[PDB]
């Protein structure tokens, strides 16, 4: 029933992002880039794929790759009407949150807005809402400027006077990401059908990475067990019970046995490839599974999280080549 | 086994309807009066809808 | 009817008393030093020694099955090994552990040594036949596409020799039991050596150095002949050394489990001792039955003799305000029936409803009368509490006695479908005029055999059984049973 | 939902009137006033007959045009990166266009059998004439609505086949068999439609 | 109603039994209570059609 529509508005853009899926480097494409020995040979094999002639004009491989996935993402947002344009805006909030914490730091230390253009992610950018460009005021008259930005509703757990050095710089990112993941789950629950069973399993595991990676690095830190409780997103499979036992953990094995209650997250704690290299391969296992379903909006968010894996993998091939340490060159993520 | 007590108390609602249903079906006869039948209609709505 | 009555130890009788106390199984050791971590429980270094033998036993029980050896059982509760015998066990346990860990790494290196030398030996015969630089081995399935690529990128040529080896050999992971083929890469040029080595790795060929001069080929063929048969000798001689200690382990591991598992259990209770205080004597605060006070004390008198200690241990009695855990008969055909409650047409309608309602009133009468005998066995907040106590009994028994009316109405459900089931059995199958007595009655009587038990006895039977639990739990155990409970949990054997 | 509340606010309300209008005709004595006989007889045999000719072609092509735009957006969507789809995958357009042929073949047939008369009394309008009226409505209904459903059927599969062929060229000739069983329902529509108008004659 | 009651807990049971084998005996309990609702409809259908 919600499938004989959705091609009225998103018929062309759906076939577009399926066509951009074919430009992802496959397994056979990955093998020939391991056989390279210099960055100039790295330039030659990438001209055989869909990326070609992008280095006509080792850290330039970082920027020229990720600038291609920005303009491909910006071209998709220019044609989505109303059922999808807000959905693509939700993917940019993860990059706007990492941008704004970068901006309140220079605001606190009186480092002006001249550093904003070259040192921010172009996906979540500030080239509209020109009030933020002018603001040099120390983080209290700037929060009144900050609410003219779609991150306003996520600041309802951010008291303005709590911003002035009582909260750590890293803590305010996670409680903003906590406010971000609850809204994007509830927005994807308002949409129903095929975009509610192919997308919400991805958001459950993404909230459960933010369950495990928080508590596994919150051991030597002087943040109490009530702080890491409210930095957990109340979203995934671990919500009523697994979030409770993660607060009392204090030990590496005490976060393992609470992951042993779920057969999905155990057999991923056998990294003993490390843990985040095991969480990444399960994440691209879920984003590949979203490409199965057809008449749904989750094919766009699965494309961006795989396109960031494409820019990640080629650099890791290039860093093993330029530094000439290609005994760990096989430790990439073969997504396709 | 401790958590079966909510679903069996929903099972009481089913046999609450089954008790009334065999009472109305056994009082049925060809040529019952109109006062007899409207009593049975409000009897069926009372156990069913409050049971709903 | 338990008591927390104290029991003293002396640490020369801390093993042999407790072990024979753990050879009885009536004791409920209670930890009374909760203000301590999981380590520093007086014996953490030695319980890891039992755990290290546990890790060795869980490892040796795995490798005893991969060689597929039959296991002796001889099932009996053995004698628990003393700490005198404990140090002598780790000499014996690690001897089996270090020998078997070494051999499986040594035999795998020896098997890798055996297949490589036989692969090198078979190329010596076929090339000295063809003779009367690179030499190597490749499988038969990849040889026609190999020479197609070898002609392509070398492109001057290399004069390739094609000769297939006999009955299949096996390199350990690649390839498993395949008959391969030899080849000859002379080419005399010493520049195309780089252009063929990439092809030899691309097609995954295994190459070996040949001596290339006449009569040294047969010289090294005689050398690898004597090397292989000595390697063939020691390979099986490691194997008969292997199986002679697997069956030596097969007479051991079953009883060796319950040696250390009984030791690890009682040492965990040695961690559960009193507060580890100030002298070389211990106290134990256990829960114990009054009917078994004498038998555990003679067992305590038995335990101090088994160590050879001259001083018997004592048993102080006291009284406190804590949980009195329950204990009863625990009979065999009373075990499963107790564990369930421990988990917590017009004329027939008028008669069977009221008599069942009085029967539920009679069941509530026997239940409420048990509350008075239980109360005899031992203002503002009292008004609001007893209001909730009384009127939830008032409107509550109505819903109880209404749920006693179902057990006639479920029998009315039992009666009606049994006739329909019955109707099919008596009517569709047997009332066929011509072809009845054979295939027609056989499938219907099979439905009368198999299809009625899943519907009338499986699902209708379990539901009324689950209803009868509800008649017991919420309708009968709500009158006298307080429902708090605390189990005994005696210190068991297995 | 804003606009769905209008249809779901009327359909509940209209059924609630027709419920209580229903228990007030029986409850007095007034079931004689209902007269489904007077509804089917006194109106016309032409209101059913001429609507069926209209619904024959119009409800078929509203599935045929539905079938086009579902896969037509997927042709040009996948055609941006893979331009080879524009020649092979036009048969998915044809199978969601041949459904419109099944209507226009049927709509000429049903209009070929409608003929006037002079009677104005439902006893003068005989049962040979009233049965000719409803049969054009029923055969026009089942060639229109079934072609609507098989029109959206081959279109949705046609959109999926346009996306699968963008990734692999060899796949499209394998998924084309699914569109045959979808378009077979259009064949199942017209066999009923001629059969319901076989023994029919007006006059 | 019995078809609706089976599908919700039958889906919820098989989503949990992959995570824990203890629910597989408890899953079949609640499915029986979702099945006897259809059985209650049958025994009143038979008593209404005989008369
Ligand atoms: C008698 C008892 C009757 C009581 C029955 C129901 C009571 C409940 C009524 C609620 C209806 C609300 C409809 C509404 O929101 O506006 C609608 C406009 O609707 C139109 O465009 C006009 C429709 C014409 C109808 C004329 C009726 C008479 C015809 C001779 C649509 O609104 P929207 O602007 O599209 O915004 C929706 C937001 N959204 C787009 C995100 C979905
Ligand atoms: C919110 C919706 C509520 C708004 C509704 C409004 C309806 C009000 C219109 C009534 C006007 C007179 C109708 C009428 O016939 O009178 C009749 C009285 O019967 C009633 O009037 C009963 C009214 C029926 C309302 C049912 C709503 C109850 C919902 C819970 C008298 O009938 P009569 O004249 O004796 O003819 C019968 C003679 N015969 C038996 C021989 C055939």
Curated annotation (Swiss-Prot), chain A:
Gene Ontology cellular component list: clathrin-coated vesicle membrane; early endosome; lysosomal membrane; plasma membrane proton-transporting V-type ATPase complex; vacuolar proton-transporting V-type ATPase complex; vacuolar proton-transporting V-type ATPase, V0 domain
Subcellular location(s) per record: Membrane; Lysosome membrane; Cytoplasmic vesicle, Clathrin-coated vesicle membrane
Family per similarity comment: Belongs to the V-ATPase V0D/AC39 subunit family.
Tissue specificity annotation: Expressed in brain (at protein level).
Keyword Membrane included in the entry's annotation: yes
Chain's role: Subunit of the V0 complex of vacuolar(H+)-ATPase (V-ATPase), a multisubunit enzyme composed of a peripheral complex (V1) that hydrolyzes ATP and a membrane integral complex (V0) that translocates protons. V-ATPase is responsible for acidifying and maintaining the pH of intracellular compartments and in some cell types, is targeted to the plasma membrane, where it is responsible for acidifying the extracellular environment. May play a role in coupling of proton transport and ATP hydrolysis.
Gene name in the database record: ATP6V0D1
GO biological process, one term: intracellular iron ion homeostasis
Recorded GO MF terms: proton-transporting ATPase activity, rotational mechanism
Membrane topology field: Peripheral membrane protein
Name the UniProt record assigns to this protein: V-type proton ATPase subunit d 1
Modified residues (Phosphotyrosine): 261
InterPro entries for this protein: ATPase_csu/dsu_sf (IPR036079), ATPase_V0-cplx_csu/dsu (IPR002843), ATPase_V0-cplx_dsu (IPR016727), V-type_ATPase_csu/dsu (IPR035067), V-type_ATPase_csu/dsu_dom_3 (IPR044911)
Residue stretches in coiled coil: none
Curated annotation (Swiss-Prot), chain D:
GO molecular function: proton-transporting ATPase activity, rotational mechanism
Site (Essential for proton translocation): 97
SUPFAM superfamilies in the cross-refs: F1F0 ATP synthase subunit C (SSF81333)
InterPro entries, per database record: ATPase_proteolipid_c-like_dom, ATPase_proteolipid_csu, F/V-ATP_Csub_sf
Topology with respect to the bilayer: Multi-pass membrane protein
Topology feature Lumenal, residues: 1-2, 72-89, 158-174
Keywords, sorted A to Z: Cytoplasmic vesicle, Hydrogen ion transport, Ion transport, Membrane, Transmembrane, Transmembrane helix, Transport
Top-level taxon in the UniProt lineage: Eukaryota
Gene3D superfamilies: lithium bound rotor ring of v- atpase (1.20.120.610)
Subcellular location: Cytoplasmic vesicle, Clathrin-coated vesicle membrane
GO biological process: pH reduction; proton transmembrane transport
Cytoplasmic side: 24-50, 111-136, 196-203
A single cellular component GO annotation: vacuolar proton-transporting V-type ATPase, V0 domain
The UniProt record lists the keyword Cytoplasm: no
Tissue: Expressed in brain (at protein level).
Residue spans crossing the bilayer: 3-23, 51-71, 90-110, 137-157, 175-195
Assembly information from the UniProt record: V-ATPase is a heteromultimeric enzyme made up of two complexes: the ATP-hydrolytic V1 complex and the proton translocation V0 complex. The V1 complex consists of three catalytic AB heterodimers that form a heterohexamer, three peripheral stalks each consisting of EG heterodimers, one central rotor including subunits D and F, and the regulatory subunits C and H. The proton translocation complex V0 consists of the proton transport subunit a, a ring of proteolipid subunits c9c'', rotary subunit d, subunits e and f, and the accessory subunits ATP6AP1/Ac45 and ATP6AP2/PRR. Interacts with IFITM3.
PANTHER family: V-TYPE PROTON ATPASE PROTEOLIPID SUBUNIT
Family: Belongs to the V-ATPase proteolipid subunit family.
Protein name: V-type proton ATPase 21 kDa proteolipid subunit c''
Species this protein is from: Bos taurus (Bovine)
Curated annotation (Swiss-Prot), chain E:
Organs and tissues of expression: Expressed in brain (at protein level).
Post-translational modifications reported in the UniProt record: Ubiquitinated by RNF182, leading to its degradation via the ubiquitin-proteasome pathway.
Transmembrane segments: 28-48
Subcellular location(s) of the protein: Cytoplasmic vesicle, Clathrin-coated vesicle membrane; Cytoplasmic vesicle, Secretory vesicle, Synaptic vesicle membrane
Chain ranges on the Cytoplasmic side, renumbered to this chain: 11-27
Residue ranges that the UniProt entry lists as topological domain Lumenal: 49-51
Residues the UniProt record annotates as site (Essential for proton translocation): 35
Function: Proton-conducting pore forming subunit of the V0 complex of vacuolar(H+)-ATPase (V-ATPase), a multisubunit enzyme composed of a peripheral complex (V1) that hydrolyzes ATP and a membrane integral complex (V0) that translocates protons. V-ATPase is responsible for acidifying and maintaining the pH of intracellular compartments and in some cell types, is targeted to the plasma membrane, where it is responsible for acidifying the extracellular environment.
SUBUNIT field: V-ATPase is a heteromultimeric enzyme made up of two complexes: the ATP-hydrolytic V1 complex and the proton translocation V0 complex. The V1 complex consists of three catalytic AB heterodimers that form a heterohexamer, three peripheral stalks each consisting of EG heterodimers, one central rotor including subunits D and F, and the regulatory subunits C and H. The proton translocation complex V0 consists of the proton transport subunit a, a ring of proteolipid subunits c9c'', rotary subunit d, subunits e and f, and the accessory subunits ATP6AP1/Ac45 and ATP6AP2/PRR.
Family according to the record: Belongs to the V-ATPase proteolipid subunit family.
UniProt protein name: V-type proton ATPase 16 kDa proteolipid subunit c
Gene that encodes it: ATP6V0C
Residues of the full protein shown: 105 to 155 of 155
């Amino acid at each position: 029933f919600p499938e004989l529509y959705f091609n009225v508005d998103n018929g062309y853009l759906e076939g577009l992002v399926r066509g951009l899926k074919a430009g992802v480097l496959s397994q056979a494409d990955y093998l020939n880039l391991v056989q390279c020995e210099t960055l100039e040979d790295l330039k030659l094999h990438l001209q055989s794929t869909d990326y070609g002639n992008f280095l006509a004009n080792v850290s330039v491989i970082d920027d020229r790759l990720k600038e291609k996935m920005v303009v491909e993402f910006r071209h998709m947002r220019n044609h989505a009407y109303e059922p999808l344009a807000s959905f693509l805006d939700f993917i940019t909030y993860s990059y706007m949150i990492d941008n704004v914490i970068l901006l309140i730091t220079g605001t606190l230390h009186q480092r002006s807005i001249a550093e904003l253009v070259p040192k921010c992610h172009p996906l979540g950018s500030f080239e509209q809402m020109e009030a933020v460009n002018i603001a040099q005021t120390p983080a209290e008259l700037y929060n009144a400027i900050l609410v003219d930005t779609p991150l306003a509703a996520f600041f309802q757990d951010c008291i303005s006077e709590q911003d002035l050095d009582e909260m750590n710089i890293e803590i305010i990112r996670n409680t903003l990401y906590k406010a971000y993941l609850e809204s994007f789950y509830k927005f994807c629950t308002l949409l129903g059908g095929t975009t509610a069973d192919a997308m919400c399993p991805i958001l459950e595991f993404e909230a459960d990475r933010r369950a495990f990676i928080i508590t596994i690095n919150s051991f030597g830190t002087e943040l109490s067990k009530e702080d890491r409780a409210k930095l957990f997103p109340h979203c995934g499979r671990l919500y009523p019970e697994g979030l409770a036992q993660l607060a009392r953990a204090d030990d590496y094995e005490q976060v393992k046995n609470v992951a042993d209650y779920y057969p999905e997250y155990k057999l991923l704690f056998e990294g003993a490839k490390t843990l985040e290299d095991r969480f990444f391969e399960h994440e691209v296992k879920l984003n590949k599974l979203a490409f199965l379903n057809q008449f749904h909006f989750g094919v766009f968010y699965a494309f961006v999280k795989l396109k960031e894996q494409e820019c990640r993998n080629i650099v890791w091939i290039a860093e093993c080549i330029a530094q000439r340490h290609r005994a760990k060159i096989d430790n990439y993520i073969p997504i396709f | 086994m401790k958590s079966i007590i909510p679903v069996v108390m929903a099972g009481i609602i089913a046999i609450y309807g089954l008790v009334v249903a065999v009472l109305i079906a056994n009082s049925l006869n060809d040529g019952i009066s109109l006062y007899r039948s409207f009593l049975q209609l409000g009897a069926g709505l009372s156990v069913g809808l409050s049971g709903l | 009817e338990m008591t927390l009555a104290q029991l003293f130890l002396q640490s020369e009788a801390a093993y042999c008393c407790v072990s024979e106390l753990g050879e009885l199984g009536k004791v409920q050791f209670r930890d009374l030093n909760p203000d301590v971590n999981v380590f520093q429980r007086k014996f953490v270094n030695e319980v890891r020694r039992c755990e290290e033998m546990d890790r060795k036993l869980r490892f040796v029980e795995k490798e005893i099955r991969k060689a597929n050896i039959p296991i002796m059982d001889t099932g009996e509760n053995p004698e628990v090994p003393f700490p005198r015998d404990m140090i002598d066990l780790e000499a014996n346990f690690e001897k089996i552990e270090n020998e078997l860990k070494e051999i499986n790494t040594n035999q795998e290196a020896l098997k890798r040594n055996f297949l490589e030398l036989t692969e090198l030996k078979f190329i010596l015969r076929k090339t000295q036949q063809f003779f009367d630089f690179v030499a190597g081995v490749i499988n038969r399935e990849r040889i026609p596409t190999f020479e197609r690529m070898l002609w392509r990128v070398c492109r001057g040529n290399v004069f390739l020799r094609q000769a297939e080896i006999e009955n299949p050999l096996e390199d350990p992971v690649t390839g498993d039991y395949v008959h391969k083929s030899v080849f000859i890469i002379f080419f005399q040029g010493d520049q195309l050596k780089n252009r063929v080595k990439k092809i030899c790795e691309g097609f995954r060929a295994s190459l070996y150095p040949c001596p290339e001069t006449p009569q040294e080929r047969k010289e090294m063929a005689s050398g690898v002949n004597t090397r292989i048969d000595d390697l063939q000798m020691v390979l099986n001689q490691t194997e008969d050394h292997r199986q002679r200690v697997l069956q030596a382990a097969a007479k051991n591991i079953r009883v060796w489990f319950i040696k250390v598992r009984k030791m690890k259990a009682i040492y965990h209770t040695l961690n559960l001792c009193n507060i580890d205080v100030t002298q070389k004597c211990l106290i134990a605060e256990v829960w114990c039955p009054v009917t078994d006070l004498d038998s555990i004390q003679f067992a305590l008198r038995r335990g101090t003799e088994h160590s050879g200690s001259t001083v018997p241990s004592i048993l102080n009695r006291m009284q406190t305000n804590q949980t009195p855990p329950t204990y009863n008969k625990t009979n065999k055909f009373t075990y499963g029936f107790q564990n369930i409650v421990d988990a917590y047409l017009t004329f027939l309608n008028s008669f069977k409803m009221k008599m069942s309602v009085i029967l539920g009133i009679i069941h509530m009468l026997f239940g409420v009368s048990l509350s008075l005998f239980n109360h005899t066995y031992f203002f503002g907040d009292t008004m609001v509490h007893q209001a909730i106590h009384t009127i939830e009994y008032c409107l509550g028994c109505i819903s109880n006695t209404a749920s006693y009316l179902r057990l006639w109405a479920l029998s009315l459900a039992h009666a009606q479908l049994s006739e329909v089931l019955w109707t099919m059995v008596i009517h569709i199958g047997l009332k066929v005029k011509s072809l009845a007595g054979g295939l027609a009655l056989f499938f219907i009587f099979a439905a009368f055999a198999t299809l009625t038990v899943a519907i009338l006895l499986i699902m209708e039977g379990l539901s009324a059984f689950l209803h009868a639990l509800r008649l017991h739990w919420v309708e009968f155990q709500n009158k006298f049973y307080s429902g708090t409970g605390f189990k005994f949990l005696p210190f068991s054997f297995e | 939902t804003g606009l769905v509340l209008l249809y779901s606010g009327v359909f509940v309300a209209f059924w609630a009137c027709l419920l209580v209008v229903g228990i007030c005709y029986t409850i007095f004595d007034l079931g004689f006033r209902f007269d489904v006989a007077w509804f089917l007889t006194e109106t016309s045999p032409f209101m059913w007959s001429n609507l069926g000719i209209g619904l024959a072609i119009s409800l078929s092509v509203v599935g045929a045009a539905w079938g086009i735009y579902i896969t037509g957006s997927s042709i040009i969507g996948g055609g941006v990166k893979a331009p080879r789809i524009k020649t092979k995958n036009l048969v998915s357009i044809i199978f969601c266009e041949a459904v419109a042929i099944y209507g226009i073949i049927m709509a000429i047939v049903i209009s070929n059998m409608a003929e006037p008369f002079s009677a104005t009394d439902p006893k003068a309008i005989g049962h040979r004439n009233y049965h000719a009226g409803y049969s054009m409505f029923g055969a026009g209904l089942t060639v229109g609505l079934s072609n609507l459903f098989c029109g959206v059927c081959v279109g949705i599969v046609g959109s999926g086949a346009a996306l699968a062929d963008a990734q692999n060229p060899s796949l499209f000739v394998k998924i084309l068999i699914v569109e045959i069983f979808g378009s077979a329902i259009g064949l199942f529509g017209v066999i009923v439609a001629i059969l319901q108008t076989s023994r029919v004659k007006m006059g | 109603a019995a078809g609706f009651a089976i599908g919700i807990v039958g889906d919820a049971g098989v989503r949990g039994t992959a995570q824990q084998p203890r629910l597989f005996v408890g899953m079949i309990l609640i499915l029986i209570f979702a099945e006897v609702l259809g059985l209650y409809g049958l025994i009143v259908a038979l008593i209404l059609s005989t008369k």
